[PDB]
Amino acid sequence: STSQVRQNYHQDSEAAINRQINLELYASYVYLSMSYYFDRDDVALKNFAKYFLHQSHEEREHAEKLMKLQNQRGGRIFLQDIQKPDEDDWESGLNAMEAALHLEKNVNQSLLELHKLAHDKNDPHLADFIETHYLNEQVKAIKELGDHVTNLRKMGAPESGLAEYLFDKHTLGDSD
Amino acid sequence: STSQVRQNYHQDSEAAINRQINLELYASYVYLSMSYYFDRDDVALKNFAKYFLHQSHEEREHAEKLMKLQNQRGGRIFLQDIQKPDEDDWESGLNAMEAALHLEKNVNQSLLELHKLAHDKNDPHLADFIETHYLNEQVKAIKELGDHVTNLRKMGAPESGLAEYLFDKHTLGDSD
Amino acid sequence: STSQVRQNYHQDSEAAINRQINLELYASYVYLSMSYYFDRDDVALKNFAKYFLHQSHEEREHAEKLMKLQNQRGGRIFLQDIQKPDEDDWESGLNAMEAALHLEKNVNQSLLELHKLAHDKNDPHLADFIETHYLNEQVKAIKELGDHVTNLRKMGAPESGLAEYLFDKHTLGDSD
Amino acid sequence: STSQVRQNYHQDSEAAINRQINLELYASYVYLSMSYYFDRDDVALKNFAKYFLHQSHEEREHAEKLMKLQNQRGGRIFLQDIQKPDEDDWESGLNAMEAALHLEKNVNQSLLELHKLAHDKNDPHLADFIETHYLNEQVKAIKELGDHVTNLRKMGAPESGLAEYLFDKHTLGDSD
Amino acid sequence: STSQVRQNYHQDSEAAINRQINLELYASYVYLSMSYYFDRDDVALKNFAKYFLHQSHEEREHAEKLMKLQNQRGGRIFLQDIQKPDEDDWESGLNAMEAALHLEKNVNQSLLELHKLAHDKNDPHLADFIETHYLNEQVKAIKELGDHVTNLRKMGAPESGLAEYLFDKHTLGDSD
Amino acid sequence: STSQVRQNYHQDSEAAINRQINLELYASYVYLSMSYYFDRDDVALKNFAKYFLHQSHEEREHAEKLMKLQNQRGGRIFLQDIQKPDEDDWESGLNAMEAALHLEKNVNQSLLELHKLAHDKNDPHLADFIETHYLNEQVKAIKELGDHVTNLRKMGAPESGLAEYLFDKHTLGDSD
Ligand SMILES: O=C(NO)c1ccc(C(=O)NO)cc1
Ligand SMILES: O=C(NO)c1ccc(C(=O)NO)cc1
Ligand code: NA
Ligand code: NA
Ligand SMILES: [Zn+2]
Ligand SMILES: [Zn+2]
Ligand SMILES: [Zn+2]
Ligand SMILES: [Zn+2]
């Protein structure tokens, strides 16, 4: 019937965790697609590609985390298909980064709704889990991407390819 | 009258912290009893005993933590007697572990009610304290114990003593 | 209009973050004033002064943290004047420490109201941010100051200067 | 029209590389599903789970490799959806391992057909790429899984849970 | 009926070991209560608190030792409730230390009666066990506490709080 | 009446030291405001922000130095409010740097007037103090800022955002 370890875990919490798992997996797929878009010889921005590939591994980690939680709280995982990304040819580093920002805002909205739920089903554990392991990472992600979009713009992207080249070398070539 | 450092600390929060202190102490007493049950020469499962003794020290730490919080927020401690454990002869490693799971679920329920309170008396500090120092530890504890019960069962406990022996050597003989 | 990274950040949250920034800056100014009060040759309590100077740097850090959050969540900073401290001549180590306790209780009250808000505007990120980076630090601060006031009193402050001297050497001369 | 770096890369080779990319991603999804099946508290086989999680990361690496090749030879990637695994509840370690063997045999068959192609479209580079980076890994994988199935069987799986427990400790607890 | 390892262990010896176990646990509870009495912000004597907390851990060790002996000699443990301490508000460091001395004298009297028994039931093992693991520790404990009471008195406790403060810094701030 | 350590310290010297303290604090506030202006996601110049934040800490140090001198020479500190910066939105790195130059020239003018005073009230100690701890630092500051303004201009600021980006990476990304 129910697992020996289930307790205060509501069914809406569970379904939302499966949906969120599928979502994070989706984000990883998107970031992968963008990554190898910038690996293409007619784009050739190694640091853009490394960057998005890192983001893709991070998303995969987020999903696996959520699955570990599902099993943890006594819930049951159910995997769904992983929707192909909306694009196969992202136009530029700037455009890829804007799509990034929109994606991260999506995932953040989903996580905020999930926290609303865990709070309404009076599930504190799930609440503070979402808080400490996802929310801040989502704010930091959205911030980083916003700064990148701002700089790419102030430089003259996507008009000037010199811009995206320099941004690739001087911003994505060191740090996180 | 009231301590110089009291602030936003409600009286129900306080009484609940004293009750929770007594509860954690109780859990330590139980874990001790089980520990030295498995030290008995007619049981002789050194790793079961070490395991539960560790859990007992951990519970003692939880209590002392809660007392430090009471003094912290301006509350006053009041100690109550420590009820002897429901059993003096736990039947098997499997049964001891099941009683463990039930106990941890009790303590978790109490902590969740306490968080409900700290949230209703609009005490955020107490809320996130409960969250970060107890709730996750309680989920992890319940999970670990549930996995152990599952394995002891799948092996053939308590019917086969060979089982409990092997579980003692291969699962409780390394790790946490 | 609105920043690319804004999301679930309410305007009351923002104004409250600017007010809190100004408040933390104020606390730093106060702690500075007290510090160099105890640097005066007619007071001459090097450890009291070092202590309050440390507290002042800490407050400055709190403010800068809050500004980083404002920019983070898509809000906009607005700096206000920094009100001079209520006193230019704090009477004794004991009195300075009591004013300290009152100040920390003020800042704590403000932070608790801000958390109430972030919870009412359903802003979990801001909620748990306040929780993990400020609330506990505020409880610990109020506790430390309360203990100090208690000891200074039990010793005979401010009546006996021998007291404040000894407290300066044996309590503020080692540790945090 | 065509990339500056394309050369001797046939269109069937390309489409087959996109199909193979999607396939490897699928295998990673399957291995993930199995992994966290064995993380469930009513299964509780940490080493089975770690094992399949490793296999999942490996599959992800295989896919990313194939994408790097696509971009390398002048081809263009096209991502497709990732089909959910045929099962959400794998019965036992033994059954999960048998499904594993069948999957690896599928992927191997696909890779062998792809090598047949690269040989028929006289694409040596693609031929020896498939050879050195995939074929041997596929034989080794199928062998390992076959040995595991053989041992789980000879032990008495899935009938005896004691078996799967021991296999989990003594075979999946050390080595690769 | 009787354990395979029982030998020369009399029933009065056993009951006395269970009573002594409960007693040592009681002493640990008392020392804990005193400890966190001195953690209270209106007392604020960190070293008094650390001291009594150490004593509490030591008492817990004494109890666990006695349980290990019970199981050792073929006896059976029976746990009883742990009586709350006679006080919830110990007046001063001096008074807490006097209550300490009285407690240690109680425990010593009990242990001496137990040795009388082990000698009358001609149980040498139990006799020299009590001798080497408890009696000296009890004399040293009573001595230490007596010296502390003497110094607190000669200083002017509990009248002068300056006294207890200094004693806290200069005697309980270093050594055991 | 007057401090035991006062000597050759004129009252105009004192009032000027309090005014200068308030001024340095003001400069720190300004530099802070600029710093977190460049932390804004729609500006996003991490190195500009780090730079001005460093300058802000430096100014705070200057103030604390002056307070230490006041107490040193037998004077008495009097703290005044800290005027909010003239701007909340500095336009560009170039404009922020120009406002910087103007500010440093202000502080330098004030310090030069203060040295004129210490020389007219025949206060050599104060004279050479101002000389060795402030004047050179002020010339170096004004020089550095002037060079920065010159380079930002020669590059094409604020017209070209590419400029400010590059200046941020190649000039503010290494050194002081
Ligand atoms: O009275 C209510 N609804 O009708 C109510 C009471 C408490 C909360 C709350 O704790 N939100 O975080 C929300 C709604
Ligand atoms: O039958 C044939 N030609 O008439 C034939 C048979 C095998 C190959 C081959 O192995 N290519 O790699 C090529 C041609
Ligand atoms: Na939290
Ligand atoms: Na000079
Ligand atoms: Zn994510
Ligand atoms: Zn993300
Ligand atoms: Zn609520
Ligand atoms: Zn506990």
Ligand SMILES: [Zn+2]
């Ligand atoms: Zn527990």
Ligand SMILES: [Zn+2]
């Ligand atoms: Zn603060």
Ligand SMILES: [Zn+2]
């Ligand atoms: Zn503070």
Ligand SMILES: [Zn+2]
């Ligand atoms: Zn593969």
Ligand SMILES: [Zn+2]
């Ligand atoms: Zn494979």
Ligand SMILES: [Zn+2]
């Ligand atoms: Zn004892």
Ligand SMILES: [Zn+2]
């Ligand atoms: Zn003792």
Ligand SMILES: [Zn+2]
């Ligand atoms: Zn300056």
Ligand SMILES: [Zn+2]
């Ligand atoms: Zn300056």
Ligand SMILES: [Zn+2]
């Ligand atoms: Zn002259």
